[PDB]
Design a protein around this ligand. Structure first.
Ligand SMILES: [K+]
Ligand SMILES: [K+]
Ligand SMILES: [K+]
Ligand SMILES: [K+]
Ligand SMILES: [K+]
Ligand SMILES: [K+]
Ligand SMILES: [K+]
Ligand SMILES: [K+]
Ligand SMILES: [K+]
Ligand SMILES: [K+]
Ligand SMILES: [K+]
Ligand SMILES: [K+]
Ligand SMILES: [K+]
Ligand SMILES: [K+]
Ligand SMILES: [K+]
Ligand SMILES: [Mg+2]
Ligand SMILES: [Mg+2]
Ligand SMILES: [Mg+2]
Ligand SMILES: [Mg+2]
Ligand SMILES: [Mg+2]
Ligand SMILES: [Mg+2]
Ligand SMILES: [Mg+2]
Ligand SMILES: [Mg+2]
Ligand SMILES: [Mg+2]
Ligand SMILES: [Mg+2]
Ligand SMILES: [Mg+2]
Ligand SMILES: [Mg+2]
Ligand SMILES: [Mg+2]
Ligand SMILES: [Mg+2]
Ligand SMILES: [Mg+2]
Ligand SMILES: [Mg+2]
Ligand SMILES: [Mg+2]
Ligand SMILES: [Mg+2]
Ligand SMILES: [Mg+2]
Ligand SMILES: [Mg+2]
Ligand SMILES: [Mg+2]
Ligand SMILES: [Mg+2]
Ligand SMILES: [Mg+2]
Ligand SMILES: [Mg+2]
Ligand SMILES: [Mg+2]
Ligand SMILES: [Mg+2]
Ligand SMILES: [Mg+2]
Ligand SMILES: [Mg+2]
Ligand SMILES: [Mg+2]
Ligand SMILES: [Mg+2]
Ligand SMILES: [Mg+2]
Ligand SMILES: [Mg+2]
Ligand SMILES: [Mg+2]
Ligand SMILES: [Mg+2]
Ligand SMILES: [Mg+2]
Ligand SMILES: [Mg+2]
Ligand SMILES: [Mg+2]
Ligand SMILES: [Mg+2]
Ligand SMILES: [Mg+2]
Ligand SMILES: [Mg+2]
Ligand SMILES: [Mg+2]
Ligand SMILES: [Mg+2]
Ligand SMILES: [Mg+2]
Ligand SMILES: [Mg+2]
Ligand SMILES: [Mg+2]
Ligand SMILES: [Mg+2]
Ligand SMILES: [Mg+2]
Ligand SMILES: [Mg+2]
Ligand SMILES: [Mg+2]
Ligand SMILES: [Mg+2]
Ligand SMILES: [Mg+2]
Ligand SMILES: [Mg+2]
Lengths: 51, 204, 100, 147
RNA sequence: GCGACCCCAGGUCAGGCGGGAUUACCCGCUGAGUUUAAGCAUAUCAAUAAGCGGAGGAAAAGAAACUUACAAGGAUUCCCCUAGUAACGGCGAGCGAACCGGGAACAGCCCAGCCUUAGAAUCGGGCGGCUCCGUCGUCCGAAUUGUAGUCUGGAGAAGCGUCCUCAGCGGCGGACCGGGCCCAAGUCCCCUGGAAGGGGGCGCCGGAGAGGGUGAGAGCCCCGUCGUGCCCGGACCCUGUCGCACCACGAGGCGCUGUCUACGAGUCGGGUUGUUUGGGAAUGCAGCCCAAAUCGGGCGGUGAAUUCCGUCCAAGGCUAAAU
RNA sequence: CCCGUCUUGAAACACGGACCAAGGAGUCUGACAUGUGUGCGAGUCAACGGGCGAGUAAACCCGUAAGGCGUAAGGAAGCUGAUUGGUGGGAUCCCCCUGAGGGGUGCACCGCCGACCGACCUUGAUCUUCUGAGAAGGGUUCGAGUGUGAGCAUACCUGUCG
RNA sequence: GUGAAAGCGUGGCCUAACGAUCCUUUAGACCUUCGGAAUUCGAAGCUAGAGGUGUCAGAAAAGUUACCACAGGGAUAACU
């Protein structure tokens, strides 16, 4: 038979976050990369990194 | 239908699902148009990639008459004032519009200067290699004969800076609101006043 | 058609600008034909004559029923503008016919 | 987001939250705006007064550009001047800045609020209210008309 | 009776053209109801499905009888916006465009009519030759009830002088599209196992750690993958360069000139009927009736007369791109 | 006493169900609304498109008088267009005093009453181009108004509708 | 209006005696609009009434079926 509520191509796949929020997220990510505790917490092995 | 809500007016009673226009090809369309422009630029080299020169025209209606934009082509009167025959203009990158009228001197003069500026920085290669004819350049076909990308005579706004004037007693006594009301009143009574004046002549 | 006063309201309102007459155009003489065309149409009128309803119009004009002649013309041609132009044409034909 | 939809919380509860008595039938009150005058009368009158009927004159082929008339109030007029020009205004009291509102996409000047104290301004606009003109004049300014 | 022309007939006469198929998109016609309105007839579903035709890689549309009322825009198409707006609607249910503005693309043109009359200057066919998508010669036809030139309203004809512009092919290369060929590094030692492609150890390639195959998780066993190099072909378009040729008679451009200055009819328009449209004293279309004009005609979203003003030039035709 | 179900009432002499496996039903989308999270804020939004770019359907950049919504309302319309708060309670803080105390402070919110803009009505010294201007002065009228902005984008639940 | 006057009178001594949208029609305002600019007809608006919906919060509406159909109802008849 036919499935319930057949999936359609015109589902709303994409999302447009405001540009300023996207810039906010990038800045936070850049700042977090300079914190060794956060870099280690994410699973990176930076035990021998000079700085 | 229940509760306090705006009255719905969804136009979804036809077979709309058969007329849905998706935009999943939007990135592909951008790619194809960029490829077309890139291919076109090489075909017309060294002619500028911006295309033909367009005139400056005012926006239409009261809402947009304060701005200017690119029009279709220079009018025949503008071309004649600039001394460019209409049959030669399209062959040297000048758009021609035989329909456009010229109701004012300011509009005519603005585009005439635009044509003269364009001719100043226009290099024309000879039709045949060796012999050089009228209108062609000499020794400039190699110096600065490069394809210009982007606009070369942009049509842009030039907003004037705030000017500080001296307030005279004449301006302080001017009644702006009174002027507007009087002008409005004279406009909507123009027909009636002209009627009685004509009727007075018949009696007299 | 005076120059604009520079005010946004009132008679002759609008932005101040130096108005100039539009350049002459070939289409300005639209509706005018050559002398030959007038000659050809005049000759064909002699050969063809007048239509039955045109004969009715001129008969009314002979008896002085100008008002009825126009109404007949409007019913036939359709518009008042064409009807009164047609009536004047019939009057011109009759005016120079009675003088011969 | 499917996992947050409350239907998931209702799995195994038979009626899906629509009741055993009333049930969830197709259109038990008609579709859309059906029965606005008959069985949804109270709803329309209580929340949508004025819905039914006709008022006013028609306007065939009404174009909105003819009616374009953006307005700016007195209190907002000073904010149009650039900051560098504001300093000049306070540096020389002999002259006054010329604020042409049309250059900022405004046609008419209304008279809400007050102007900066001790600062004459020459306002250039297509239209102006009488209160706006009075406030400009009493502050030492003047009004110029354009189009 | 013999001839010319006219109309028509026959021909297995010489040489051509047409039918049918396909369905995604495209063009024309025809045309419902379920349904919604909590009933139902106008309406809505829908100018849709079904039905009948016709095309192409696109089709259709297209160089204003336009938008507008502004300081004015300027073929068509398409996107955003205009806007769920003006409007339409048992003014109920519902329905619903357009201009401005911002962008994609961009391209303009050909005829009909007065104008060779010291020359039908035009075209087809048969036959022959050549440098063969054509061209030349010759013959027989078409055509004066008009072929070719000139002209298309943006103009133009004619006269005058400024003395500005205009005449081909070939060689090579690039660009474009398609294909073919070679080219990195372990299968080293131990253990388990039917099999190592697994674990441990020791190495290597990497502009190649995409993917697949091979007896289990394989960059280095195999095909490939990355990046060069080499070779072959298709388009004849675009473009660079070289060689040869390069008659301005004529035509065009520019300037002036008294004068001339031709533009589509049972069509426009009107009445009426039906249908359709957001179009409302009537948006388009169609039938029937009436039936134009040339200092004129159409449009200017309320019918009518009167005075102005703005605007364009229908009733013939072709045309790439954005979709 | 047999589960499921409609029911005032089911163990019912009400209906479905012999048994097992697997499949099997509030979803997607448009509009709007309240709430909440986030960004910015009298602004906000990179949305058509362009510039590019992980050799790239992503990400990044671009709004120059673009546009949407908001920034001003009332009126059928012609049109006109906010003179810019008083008071009773009240959070917090400050001082005195150590009381169910007394002063100063008075945000948010609520009640009450003016003023201002507009429809309607009313009013008119003094001027004017004769129909407009407006000194003063209004109203048991009406408004989805004003009296120092709160919106815009976005995510999701719930609800109405197609 | 009435009474000398206080006062009374916004229909009937009090408790019933009546009617939306759209459309039409009338009355009123030297009123507004017909959107290129005017004049006069015509038309369209604003304010208050009238023409009616008695199923009276207001669709425009005759039968038959023993030839019958479907969704249901033990919310409801014809047995125990
Ligand atoms: K698409
Ligand atoms: K529920
Ligand atoms: K031949
Ligand atoms: K492998
Ligand atoms: K012609
Ligand atoms: K019609
Ligand atoms: K005309
Ligand atoms: K049940
Ligand atoms: K039961
Ligand atoms: K049972
Ligand atoms: K709600
Ligand atoms: K904005
Ligand atoms: K931009
Ligand atoms: K009103
Ligand atoms: K009833
Ligand atoms: Mg449907
Ligand atoms: Mg443009
Ligand atoms: Mg429960
Ligand atoms: Mg249930
Ligand atoms: Mg229910
Ligand atoms: Mg539902
Ligand atoms: Mg044969
Ligand atoms: Mg129904
Ligand atoms: Mg139903
Ligand atoms: Mg039915
Ligand atoms: Mg079909
Ligand atoms: Mg076919
Ligand atoms: Mg084909
Ligand atoms: Mg294409
Ligand atoms: Mg075509
Ligand atoms: Mg033309
Ligand atoms: Mg156009
Ligand atoms: Mg909107
Ligand atoms: Mg429709
Ligand atoms: Mg369009
Ligand atoms: Mg446009
Ligand atoms: Mg000829
Ligand atoms: Mg010539
Ligand atoms: Mg000539
Ligand atoms: Mg190893
Ligand atoms: Mg195995
Ligand atoms: Mg290998
Ligand atoms: Mg390669
Ligand atoms: Mg024509
Ligand atoms: Mg007709
Ligand atoms: Mg039809
Ligand atoms: Mg065509
Ligand atoms: Mg029971
Ligand atoms: Mg039970
Ligand atoms: Mg029992
Ligand atoms: Mg049952
Ligand atoms: Mg059973
Ligand atoms: Mg299962
Ligand atoms: Mg929110
Ligand atoms: Mg804007
Ligand atoms: Mg008013
Ligand atoms: Mg007031
Ligand atoms: Mg008395
Ligand atoms: Mg009574
Ligand atoms: Mg009595
Ligand atoms: Mg009484
Ligand atoms: Mg009544
Ligand atoms: Mg009425
Ligand atoms: Mg009009
Ligand atoms: Mg009732
Ligand atoms: Mg029956
Ligand atoms: Mg019972």
């Amino acid at each position: 038979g036919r499935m319930f509520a057949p999936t359609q191509t015109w589902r709303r796949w994409h999302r447009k976050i405001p540009v300023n929020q996207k810039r906010y997220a990038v800045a936070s990510a850049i700042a977090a990369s300079s914190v060794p505790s956060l870099v280690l917490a994410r699973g990176h092995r930076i035990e021998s990194v000079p700085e | 239908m229940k509760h306090n809500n705006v009255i719905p007016n969804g136009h979804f009673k036809k077979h709309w699902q058969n007329y849905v226009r998706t935009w999943f090809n939007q990135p592909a369309r951008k790619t194809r148009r960029r490829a077309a422009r890139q291919k076109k630029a090489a075909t017309i080299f060294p002619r500028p990639t911006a295309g033909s020169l367009r005139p400056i025209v005012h926006g239409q209606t009261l809402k947009y008459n304060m701005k200017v934009r690119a029009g279709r082509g220079f009018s025949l009167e503008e071309l004649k004032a600039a001394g460019i025959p209409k049959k030669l203009a399209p062959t040297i990158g000048i758009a021609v519009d035989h329909r456009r009228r010229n109701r004012s001197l300011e509009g005519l003069q603005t585009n005439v200067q635009r044509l003269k500026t364009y001719k100043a920085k226009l290099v024309i290669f000879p039709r045949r290699a060796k012999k050089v004819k009228a209108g062609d350049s000499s020794a400039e076909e190699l110096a600065n004969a490069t394809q210009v990308q982007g606009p070369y005579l942009p049509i842009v706004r030039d907003q004037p800076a705030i000017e500080l004037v001296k307030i005279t007693d004449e301006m302080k006594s001017f009644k702006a609101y009174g002027k507007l009301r009087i002008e409005r009143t004279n406009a909507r009574h123009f027909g009636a006043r002209l009627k009685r004046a004509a009727e007075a002549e018949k009696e007299e | 058609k005076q120059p604009n006063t520079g005010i946004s309201v009132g008679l002759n309102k609008g932005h101040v600008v130096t108005k100039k007459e539009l350049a002459p155009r070939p289409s300005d003489r639209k509706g005018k034909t050559s002398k030959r065309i007038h000659f050809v149409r005049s000759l064909i009128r002699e050969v063809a004559g007048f239509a039955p309803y045109e004969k009715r119009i001129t008969e009314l004009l002979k008896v002085g029923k100008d008002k009825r002649a126009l109404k007949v013309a409007k019913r036939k041609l359709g518009t008042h503008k064409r009807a009164k132009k047609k009536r004047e044409e019939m009057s011109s034909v009759l005016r120079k016919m009675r003088a011969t | 987001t499917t996992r947050f939809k409350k239907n998931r919380k209702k799995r195994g509860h038979v009626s899906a939250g629509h009741g055993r008595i009333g049930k969830h039938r197709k259109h038990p009150g008609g579709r859309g705006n059906a029965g606005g005058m008959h069985h949804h009368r109270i709803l329309f009158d209580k929340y949508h007064p004025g819905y039914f009927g006709k008022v006013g004159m028609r306007y065939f082929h009404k174009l909105r550009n003819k009616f374009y008339c953006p307005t700016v109030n007195i209190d907002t007029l000073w904010s149009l001047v650039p900051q560098e020009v504001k300093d000049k205004a306070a540096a020389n009291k002999g002259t006054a800045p010329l604020i042409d509102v049309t250059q900022f996409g405004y046609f008419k000047v209304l008279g809400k609020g007050v102007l900066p104290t001790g600062q004459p301004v020459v306002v250039k606009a297509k239209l102006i209210s009488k209160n706006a003109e009075k406030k400009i004049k009493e502050n030492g300014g003047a009004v110029v008309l354009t189009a």
